Symmetry: C2
Subunit: 246 residues, 2 copies
């Protein structure tokens, strides 16, 4: 019953010309009936991207703040994101946490506000290499997930994304089995701490390295319900990742 | 000689398409003197939208940007994207970036260097908090901030410096026109001493923090105050009175 979920995080990449070309490819692509597709453009192009993209693709903001309006130069609110036609926001992404210092407390508050305002949330968690090697993977990801869970009432509006931050330019990489074991642990957490119905119906998506060559094996893992895709999301290869269950 | 009067409107995180449409309609209708250079900084989601609706007489600015052209920086925008949306300016080092979101001087310096290399103009913001003001060290704080910016500028024709008394914002304290002029004079002296006399005399140093339609005239007439970076008042028709502060 869990609908396969493929998020494309464009990060800080592209211009109207190149992203227009990419959107033409995604508009033309056949999306499977069993798959939900979301694209997260740079904040300057949420509006542009929603206008050009076909309704079969939903649009996500890459981040947002925790009040509707205010003196927060450089921020955007859930209200603005909806006003541009986007229905999702990515929150707690590893880059926000570890490049820009976004705390769990702040991220939990963003989740609550985004959800209260009617957005759906891709909520990102994950451990760094020092944390994984000290043995505290479970501790880190369960705690991050708890802060998210404290600020979620309706889990039908949420997707969890596991980011193996330990495998980003570190000299280590995650196997499909290593991805699967974290994913099953997280699903057990949902069963244990909220509901068996929530555990079974919540998409837990893989946010580590995924390509067209690697996506089918990763998607076949029982507790991996799709991907939050990085670099490949800017290429036609993204459509191969959309087709990962076919 | 003669520094062109500069009025920037920082909308911050305010407005939607419809309410900003109404604000933009009010701005388009208003008389903008050729004396004045007007720039508006919409929320990042509406840079493109604002540029399409605004009359070309008003320039559009981003409220922040990052320091590379493209990369793995979820939630950031680059100068390339800002230019691509038709905006010509970027606000950098704003007090909220520095003190709410922890942006360091080093980071802000790097953003300045990149923005200018990419063909954007920069409103570079500086200013001291109340604990720094009450401890007698505003010069040290604002000069050091100005030095890091200065180190990353090669064309001062494309830069505007904005003094933001953070000490007189949300603290129950008022900054008088003499206090503003005191900081602006010393900043102009810094540029003379440390860059060149050509840069000191040609560069706009604008004032931020509680600019109203009543207070603007007396602030504008101060010899080293070359204009304004307006916050809350930039969402109101009162902004037009600040544009006409010299008139």
């Amino acid at each position: 019953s869990r609908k396969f979920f493929v998020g494309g995080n464009w990060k800080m990449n592209g211009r109207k010309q190149s992203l227009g070309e990419l959107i033409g490819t995604l508009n033309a692509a056949k999306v499977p009936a069993d798959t939900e597709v979301v694209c997260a453009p740079p904040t300057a192009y949420i509006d542009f991207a929603r206008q050009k993209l076909d309704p079969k693709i939903a649009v996500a903001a890459q981040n947002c703040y925790k009040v509707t309006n205010g003196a927060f130069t450089g921020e955007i609110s859930p209200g603005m994101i909806k006003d541009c036609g986007a229905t999702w926001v990515v929150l707690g992404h590893s880059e926000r946490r570890h490049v820009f210092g976004e705390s769990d407390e702040l991220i939990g508050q963003k989740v609550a506000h985004a959800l209260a305002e009617g957005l759906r949330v891709i909520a990102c968690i994950g451990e760094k290499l020092d944390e994984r090697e000290a043995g505290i993977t479970e501790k880190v990801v369960f705690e991050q997930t708890k802060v998210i869970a404290d600020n979620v009432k309706d889990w039908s509006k949420v997707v969890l994304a596991y980011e193996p931050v330990w495998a980003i330019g570190t000299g280590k990489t995650a196997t499909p089995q290593q991805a699967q074991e974290v994913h099953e642990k997280l699903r057990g957490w949902l069963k244990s701490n909220v509901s068996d119905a929530v555990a079974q119906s919540t998409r837990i998506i893989y946010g580590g390295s995924v390509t067209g060559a690697t996506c089918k094996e990763l998607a076949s893992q029982p507790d991996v319900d799709g991907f939050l895709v990085g670099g490949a999301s800017l290429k036609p290869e993204f459509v191969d990742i959309i087709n990962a269950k076919q």
